[PDB]
Enzyme design. Structure first.
Site, short mmCIF file in Angstrom:
data_model
loop_
_atom_site.label_atom_id
_atom_site.label_comp_id
_atom_site.label_asym_id
_atom_site.label_seq_id
_atom_site.Cartn_x
_atom_site.Cartn_y
_atom_site.Cartn_z
N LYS A 186 59.17 39.55 37.39
CA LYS A 186 58.46 40.40 38.44
C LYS A 186 58.91 40.20 39.90
O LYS A 186 59.18 40.96 40.67
CB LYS A 186 56.89 40.71 38.23
CG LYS A 186 56.25 39.36 38.43
CD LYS A 186 54.83 39.58 38.03
CE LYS A 186 54.08 38.37 38.51
NZ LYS A 186 52.26 38.63 38.10
N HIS A 204 46.16 34.80 36.67
CA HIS A 204 45.44 35.49 36.01
C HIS A 204 44.03 35.57 37.04
O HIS A 204 43.61 36.63 37.20
CB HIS A 204 44.97 35.18 34.62
CG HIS A 204 43.98 35.85 33.89
ND1 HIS A 204 43.89 37.31 33.61
CD2 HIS A 204 42.55 35.63 33.77
CE1 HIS A 204 42.81 37.62 33.18
NE2 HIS A 204 41.75 36.73 33.36
#
EC number: 3.6.5.3
Lengths: 111, 384, 177
Positions: free
Chosen positions: B15, B75
């Site tokens: 990404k 996360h």
């Protein structure tokens, strides 16, 4: 020209955390009443006790407006010097020393 | 025109490579990216300010819009960034490597993105150059749409680009064109975000006063919409919802006839009594907000270094929930099989409060215990 | 009321006397959280407020705002008999305000106006009595110039002042009205 602050002449800096001065000459309907720091102490106590709201300026303006609409009603019935007042939800006491041609307000309580 | 987009996907799926390629390629084919700084650095529910989110940032520019692109490194950072409102988003870019399918972490991330109400998601398949077959691409492109549709996204209508960021930033054409089609989908599929001034009016009450001969006045800062003099407003909160009319709006400098969102104003009401109004209530357009007591939400508990608990809490936990202007103590229900909630992990929970509070889907709140902020959450589904 | 302890924190207590407000004592500059009050006397003519922090029992300021010239009594000299008790700022059991968390000032002010107040003033010292009761117990000494006295029934009853020079009782009498 402001809405309410045009009737207030500030004499001391603002109480910590508010926008109301420690003492001021309030000009209501032409009468000049100097506010003793105790009234402002209790008003700042009211505005701070709820917790820091970060929008204290408009609340202080509304508090001063309520105080003015109460002192005009105190003038409506005549000033009882050194006696508690009967204005609804408020109570005020006044005084006048010889050196002061303007009356002084020593007490402000908003129940 | 300024639009905020976000990236969702596995870290090693490329990404960051995609972001770098987008920036460099759109800087080549179009003008240079503007340096504008249009957005704030924080979020609603001000008591949840100071969680130290990382919030990696980039910016690029298309001929029609200027895009601020945000992604999270881990996360915990992502879940804190979604649960709090920091770096608000009008659209998300799902990044999946065509070499290895979507991950359970990505599935949980898009579930969270639905719960927080990410309006639109477009998919970019990376590393489609390292595969010599178009049919496997078809099957993975079908399964990502199937997953999106599983979590209520329009999987059938979701735009999907089959490109490769690395070869694109290596100057090879037919991939620069693919990420340019990605930017075009950003321009076309993502609508303009709803301006706050056009939303329904809503004002949290902060302080209440009464002026002799004038009436009751409430002093708060308006969150959404616009309020003008003479309009009827519904107060909603702890007590039963009441109706009143705004007989004037007062500001610290001058009296105005209309109150726009973001301004600290003073609203004079009609007929209402000081005793009937309280702090936790809100003024709103009649019928635009409803009071609720029970709601399903997603929450993040602060860790020990972030100022939260040093120990977990259990089913019998009863904290205070700080909404716009007040705390209300609430009782929680945990998912089946969850015996304990450690500090630092996110979880779903069904909270029922002791007094009703005006709420809609997406409203954020803080979780305190004794005046110290210990967690943050966002309501996902209002209940009875 | 209930008073339950004393401390020993050395900090300057300032005492000014304006021509408008009769008396006022400020032991500490409280800005962490405003105090809550107990108001004694006759609500119309003789009001004396006492402030105490919400976090603990420490006081902020106790001042009377108005007193009647009839409810006072000037005498020739003191009965200065003083058994010195523990020195320092007293504390107060804050159970009187069971719900000080509603954040409404109404439930924050407990004031029993059924108890009147007398003031014995002289050119040497001034003392204040409350309740019209014959109760006397230990005498806490905040500063050498300011003492205070508790009663047997768990309450502060008598107040005393020292080192006062009539140059300021001039303003005190200009303010008593």
């Amino acid at each position: 020209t402001g809405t309410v602050f045009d009737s207030i002449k500030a004499t001391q800096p603002a109480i910590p955390g508010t926008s109301i001065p420690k003492s001021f000459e309030l000009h209501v309907n032409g009468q000049t009443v100097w506010v003793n720091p105790n009234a402002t102490k209790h008003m700042g106590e009211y505005l701070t006790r709820n917790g820091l709201s970060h929008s204290t300026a408009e609340g202080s303006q509304a508090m001063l407006t309520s105080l003015q609409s109460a002192v005009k009603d105190a003038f409506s019935q005549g000033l009882k010097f050194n006696e508690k007042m009967q204005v609804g939800r408020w109570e005020l006491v006044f005084s006048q020393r010889s050196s002061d041609p303007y009356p002084v307000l020593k007490h402000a309580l908003y129940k | 025109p300024h639009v905020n987009v976000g990236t969702i996907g596995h870290v090693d799926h490329g990404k960051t490579t995609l972001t770098a390629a987008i920036t460099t390629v759109l800087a080549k084919t179009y003008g240079g990216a503007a340096r504008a700084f249009d957005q704030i650095d924080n979020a609603p529910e001000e008591k949840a300010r100071g969680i130290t989110i990382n919030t990696s940032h980039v910016e690029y520019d298309t001929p029609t819009r200027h895009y601020a692109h945000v992604d999270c490194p881990g996360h915990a950072d992502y879940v804190k960034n979604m649960i709090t409102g920091a770096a608000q988003m009008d659209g998300a870019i799902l990044v999946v490597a065509a070499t290895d399918g979507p991950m359970p972490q990505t599935r949980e991330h898009i579930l969270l993105g639905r719960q927080v109400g990410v309006p639109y998601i477009i998919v970019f398949l990376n590393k489609c150059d390292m595969v010599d077959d178009e049919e496997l691409l078809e099957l993975v492109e079908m399964e990502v749409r199937e997953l999106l549709s599983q979590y209520d996204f329009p999987g059938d209508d979701t735009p999907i680009v089959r490109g490769s960021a690395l070869k694109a930033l290596e100057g090879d054409a037919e991939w620069e064109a693919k990420i340019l089609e990605l930017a075009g989908f950003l321009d076309s599929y993502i609508p303009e975000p709803e301006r706050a001034i056009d939303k329904p009016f809503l004002l949290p009450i902060e302080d209440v006063f009464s002026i002799s001969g004038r009436g009751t006045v409430v002093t708060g800062r308006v969150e959404r919409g616009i309020i003008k003099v003479g309009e009827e407003v519904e107060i909603v909160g702890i007590k039963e919802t009441q109706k009143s009319t705004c007989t004037g709006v007062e500001m610290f400098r001058k009296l105005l006839d209309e109150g726009r969102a973001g301004e600290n104003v003073g609203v004079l009401l009609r007929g209402i009594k000081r005793e009937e109004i309280e702090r936790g209530q809100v003024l709103a357009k009649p019928g635009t907000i409803k009071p609720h007591t029970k709601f399903e939400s997603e929450v993040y508990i602060l860790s020990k270094d972030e100022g939260g608990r040093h120990t977990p809490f259990f089913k019998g936990y009863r904290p205070q929930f700080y909404f716009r202007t007040t705390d209300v103590t609430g009782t929680i229900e945990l998912p089946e099989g969850v015996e304990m909630v450690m500090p630092g992990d996110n979880i779903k929970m069904v909270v029922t409060l002791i007094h009703p509070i005006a709420m809609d889907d997406g409203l954020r709140f803080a979780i305190r215990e004794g005046g110290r902020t210990v967690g943050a959450g966002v309501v996902a589904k209002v209940l009875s | 009321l209930t008073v339950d302890s004393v401390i020993n924190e050395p900090r300057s207590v300032a005492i000014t006397i304006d021509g408008y407000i009769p008396v006022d004592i400020k032991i500490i500059d409280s800005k962490k959280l405003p105090p809550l009050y107990w108001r004694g006397g006759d609500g119309k003519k003789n009001l004396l407020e006492l402030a105490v922090l919400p976090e603990n029992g420490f006081l902020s300021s106790i001042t009377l705002v108005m007193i009647a010239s009839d409810s006072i009594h000037k005498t020739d000299s003191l009965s200065v008999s003083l058994p010195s008790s523990e020195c320092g700022v007293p504390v107060v059991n804050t159970k009187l305000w069971s719900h000080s968390e509603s954040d409404d000032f109404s439930r924050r002010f407990v004031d029993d106006f059924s108890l009147d107040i007398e003031v014995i003033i002289s050119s040497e010292s001034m003392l204040l009595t409350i309740g019209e009761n014959k109760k006397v117990t230990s005498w806490i000494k905040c500063s050498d110039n300011f003492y205070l006295g508790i009663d047997a029934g768990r309450n502060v009853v008598h107040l005393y002042l020292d080192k006062l020079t009539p140059s300021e009782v001039e303003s005190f009498f200009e303010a008593v009205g």
